[PDB]
Amino acid sequence: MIVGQEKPYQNKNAINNGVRI
Amino acid sequence: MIVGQEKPYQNKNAINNGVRI
Amino acid sequence: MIVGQEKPYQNKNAINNGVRI
Amino acid sequence: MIVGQEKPYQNKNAINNGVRI
Amino acid sequence: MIVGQEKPYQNKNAINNGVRI
Amino acid sequence: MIVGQEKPYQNKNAINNGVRI
Amino acid sequence: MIVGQEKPYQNKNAINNGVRI
Amino acid sequence: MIVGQEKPYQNKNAINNGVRI
Amino acid sequence: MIVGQEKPYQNKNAINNGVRI
Amino acid sequence: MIVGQEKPYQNKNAINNGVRI
Known part of the structure; x- marks a missing residue:
């Protein structure tokens, strides 16, 4: 049972790589 | 049972690579 | 049972690569 | 049972690599 | 049972590598 | 010029939510 | 110039939420 | 110039929330 | 110039929240 | 110039919250 x-x-999973304003 | x-x-999964304003 | x-x-899955205004 | x-x-998991203002 | x-x-897990203002 | x-x-942007074998 | x-x-941006084997 | x-x-940005084997 | x-x-940025084997 | x-x-930035074997 995997x-x-x-x-x-x-669950807010964010990978921010740019610009947020 | 995988x-x-x-x-x-x-679940808000976001990969932001650009610009958000 | 996979x-x-x-x-x-x-579930809001977003991959933002451009511009959002 | 893995x-x-x-x-x-x-759970707010964020990997901020750019700019947030 | 792993x-x-x-x-x-x-749990706010943040890896801040850029700029936050 | 936004x-x-x-x-x-x-750039391999993947949001894996299911099963990959 | 934003x-x-x-x-x-x-840049391998991955948000793994499920099972990978 | 933001x-x-x-x-x-x-840059390997990973948010692992599940199981990896 | 922000x-x-x-x-x-x-840069290996990992937020491991689950199981890795 | 911020x-x-x-x-x-x-730079290996890891936030390990679960199990690694």
Whole structure:
């Protein structure tokens, strides 16, 4: 039973490489 | 039973490479 | 039973490479 | 039973490489 | 039963490599 | 002159949410 | 002259949320 | 002249939230 | 001249939240 | 001239929150 995630709730995964204003 | 995710709820996965204003 | 996701609800997956204003 | 995460709630994972203003 | 995390709640994991203003 | 990216070369942007074997 | 990235070369940006074997 | 990154070369930005084997 | 990074070379930025084997 | 980093070379920035074997 190999499983990644169970009920991830609003996990904000961001990889910001540019510009945010 | 190999499974990635169970009920991911509003997980904001963003890879920002440009410009956001 | 190899399965990717079960009931993903409004997961906003965005790969922004350009400009958003 | 190899599993990554159980109910991660609003975990803000950010890799900021550019500019945020 | 090898598992990474159980109910991580709002863990702000940030790798800041650029500029934040 | 607001521009997102100039000559992005083979940038592999992947958002893996399921199973890859 | 607001710009995100200049010549990003093979930047592997991955947000792994499931299972990779 | 607000700019995020100049010639990022093979920067491996990974946000691993699940299982990798 | 506000800029995040200049020629980042193979910077391995990882946020491991699950299981790696 | 506000700038984050100049030629970061193979800086391994890791935030390990789970299990690594």
